[PDB]
Amino acid sequence: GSAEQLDALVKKDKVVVFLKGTPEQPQCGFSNAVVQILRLHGVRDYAAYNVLDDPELRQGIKDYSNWPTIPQVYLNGEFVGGCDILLQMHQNGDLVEELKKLGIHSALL
Amino acid sequence: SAEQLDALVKKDKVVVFLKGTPEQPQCGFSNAVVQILRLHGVRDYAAYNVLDDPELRQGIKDYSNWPTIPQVYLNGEFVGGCDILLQMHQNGDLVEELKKLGIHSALLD
Amino acid sequence: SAEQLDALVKKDKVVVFLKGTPEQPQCGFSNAVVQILRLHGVRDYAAYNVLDDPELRQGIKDYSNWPTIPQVYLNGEFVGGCDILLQMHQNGDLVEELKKLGIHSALLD
Amino acid sequence: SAEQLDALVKKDKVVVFLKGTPEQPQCGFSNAVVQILRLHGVRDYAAYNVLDDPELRQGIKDYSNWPTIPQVYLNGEFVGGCDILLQMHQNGDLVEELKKLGIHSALLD
Numbered sequence: 409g410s411a412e413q414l415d416a417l418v419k420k421d422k423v424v425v426f427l428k429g430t431p432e433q434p435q436c437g438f439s440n441a442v443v444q445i446l447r448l449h450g451v452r453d454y455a456a457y458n459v460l461d462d463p464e465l466r467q468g469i470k471d472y473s474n475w476p477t478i479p480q481v482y483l484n485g486e487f488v489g490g491c492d493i494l495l496q497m498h499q500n501g502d503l504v505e506e507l508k509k510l511g512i513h514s515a516l517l
Numbered sequence: 518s519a520e521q522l523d524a525l526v527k528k529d530k531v532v533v534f535l536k537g538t539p540e541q542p543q544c545g546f547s548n549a550v551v552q553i554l555r556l557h558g559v560r561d562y563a564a565y566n567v568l569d570d571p572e573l574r575q576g577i578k579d580y581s582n583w584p585t586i587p588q589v590y591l592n593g594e595f596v597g598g599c600d601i602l603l604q605m606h607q608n609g610d611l612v613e614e615l616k617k618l619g620i621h622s623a624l625l626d
Numbered sequence: 627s628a629e630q631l632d633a634l635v636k637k638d639k640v641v642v643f644l645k646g647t648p649e650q651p652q653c654g655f656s657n658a659v660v661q662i663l664r665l666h667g668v669r670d671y672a673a674y675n676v677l678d679d680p681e682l683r684q685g686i687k688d689y690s691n692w693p694t695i696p697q698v699y700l701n702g703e704f705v706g707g708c709d710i711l712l713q714m715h716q717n718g719d720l721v722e723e724l725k726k727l728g729i730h731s732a733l734l735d
Numbered sequence: 736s737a738e739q740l741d742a743l744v745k746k747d748k749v750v751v752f753l754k755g756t757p758e759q760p761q762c763g764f765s766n767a768v769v770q771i772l773r774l775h776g777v778r779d780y781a782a783y784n785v786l787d788d789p790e791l792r793q794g795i796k797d798y799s800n801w802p803t804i805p806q807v808y809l810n811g812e813f814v815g816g817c818d819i820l821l822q823m824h825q826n827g828d829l830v831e832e833l834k835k836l837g838i839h840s841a842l843l844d
């Protein structure tokens with residue numbers, strides 16, 4: 409929930425996502441689109457947090473990022489966007505480069 | 518099962534299937550139904566949280582022949598989702614349908 | 627007009643109302659309908675662009691009592707929007723429906 | 736073109752890219768931005784209809800690195816789409832950003 413607690417969370421790992429549901433079982437198409445894109449580039453090692461489990465987290469990640477919706481994508485402790493931005497980076501090669509920057513070899517390469 | 522859901526929707530005049538509960542909705546689409554019913558002062562309706570039950574979630578889509586959540590039922594009859602409910606709220610049809618079922622909308626006066 | 631619109635949906639076996647044209651649709655929701663029809667090889671259909679005329683945009687909603695665009699009609703009867711059509715595409719109902727109207731789905735071929 | 740669009744967005748204090756016009760929006764997401772601006776007393780501003788120009792439509796997505804329409808610009812700074820604009824409306828950041836540009840929101844009165 410907290411601002412200090414979320415700052416830790418996003419910096420904790422290279423690729424961090426906030427979803428409705430889980431990678432195994434997403435509860436929302438927008439959250440799912442993110443899970444599938446990560447699957448396509450072969451990113452198996454990322455942090456996923458379920459906002460349905462905690463209303464304080466649901467509300468807290470919005471306040472932290474200044475972003476009104478879920479899913480939220482962080483690369484390198486920095487906010488990237490939601491599923492629309494992510495699909496866009498998937499289609500124009502930008503995500504492959506962002507992944508390369510984190511030391512992550514994308515499967516589409 | 519179509520037979521169990523048949524019973525469920527005949528069991529109360531007003532029956533809704535949501536993501537979350539009326540006291541804690543988990544999706545703006547489901548919240549829109551909740552807030553519309555709150556505006557009309559429809560206090561006692563059965564509300565079923567599909568996030569708890571994967572089988573109810575699929576069962577209700579099969580029974581309704583409708584792909585998404587929320588789902589609204591009046592008098593055991595399928596009415597629609599949030600778009601239809603909002604349309605009914607804006608054109609007066611919801612006040613009428615509720616009145617024919619002996620429900621007095623708070624928007625009548 | 628209800629008059630003119632009733633004539634439009636009964637004129638052809640498959641009638642769609644879209645934002646845009648099948649050649650260049652102007653919206654993901656309308657495009658989703660177009661992409662489906664294409665996957666089934668449905669060549670002969672009437673498409674009408676609601677962007678062209680505000681009276682059409684409002685007209686088709688009041689005729690179908692359906693609040694959004696796209697709208698799909700088969701055999702003069704309202705079937706639904708893009709969500710309902712995807713559901714039928716996935717569960718095999720679209721194939722059978724087309725079979726009923728004497729129309730060969732490409733997925734059979 | 737990047738240089739051309741860069742000039743275009745910097746030319747006016749408020750710049751929006753919509754589907755349709757402020758008088759006749761062709762999409763709920765574009766309309767939300769128009770309605771939000773209207774509540775702040777911003778009635779006259781530069782509005783470009785992407786449905787009239789596929790080059791501008793794609794160009795603006797490339798320039799902003801933002802996948803969708805509407806897009807809102809303030810002194811040529813990208814602000815975002817309707818979800819962000821609505822958030823700025825609710826938390827008071829929109830009143831504050833407009834004020835810094837010498838526009839006095841009707842909400843401030």
Ligand SMILES: N[C@@H](CCC(=O)N[C@@H](CS)C(=O)NCC(=O)O)C(=O)O
Nearest residue numbers: 438477478479490491492493544545
């Ligand atoms: N265009 C968004 C789609 C995501 C979205 O609109 N999410 C909504 C519905 S799941 C949301 O998080 N609303 C607030 C909430 O439910 O907490 C994106 O690209 O990420």
Ligand SMILES: N[C@@H](CCC(=O)N[C@@H](CS)C(=O)NCC(=O)O)C(=O)O
Nearest residue numbers: 435544546585586587598599600601
């Ligand atoms: N336009 C719909 C909005 C509802 C909707 O698109 N629901 C989606 C997103 S919550 C859904 O039920 N997804 C399937 C699922 O979560 O099981 C309506 O009028 O009800």
Ligand SMILES: N[C@@H](CCC(=O)N[C@@H](CS)C(=O)NCC(=O)O)C(=O)O
Nearest residue numbers: 655694695696707708709710762763
């Ligand atoms: N869930 C809908 C999606 C279509 C939709 O929500 N259409 C909207 C946006 S294009 C609409 O027609 N809104 C009123 C309008 O634009 O006239 C479906 O299954 O067809």
Ligand SMILES: N[C@@H](CCC(=O)N[C@@H](CS)C(=O)NCC(=O)O)C(=O)O
Nearest residue numbers: 652762764803804805816817818819
């Ligand atoms: N979540 C978006 C909603 C706008 C949106 O999803 N726009 C879509 C549908 S109108 C779009 O511009 N799609 C590509 C296109 O039509 O050019 C926002 O916050 O602005």
Ligand code: FES
Nearest residue numbers: 428435436544546
């Ligand atoms: S859970 Fe309903 S749209 Fe995301």
Ligand code: FES
Nearest residue numbers: 645653655762764
């Ligand atoms: S035109 Fe914007 S969502 Fe259909």
Ligand SMILES: [Cl-]
Nearest residue numbers: 523524527593
């Ligand atoms: Cl029965």
Ligand SMILES: [Cl-]
Nearest residue numbers: 542544545548
């Ligand atoms: Cl909600």
Ligand SMILES: [Cl-]
Nearest residue numbers: 530618619620
């Ligand atoms: Cl009663």
Ligand SMILES: [Cl-]
Nearest residue numbers: 760762763766
């Ligand atoms: Cl509109």
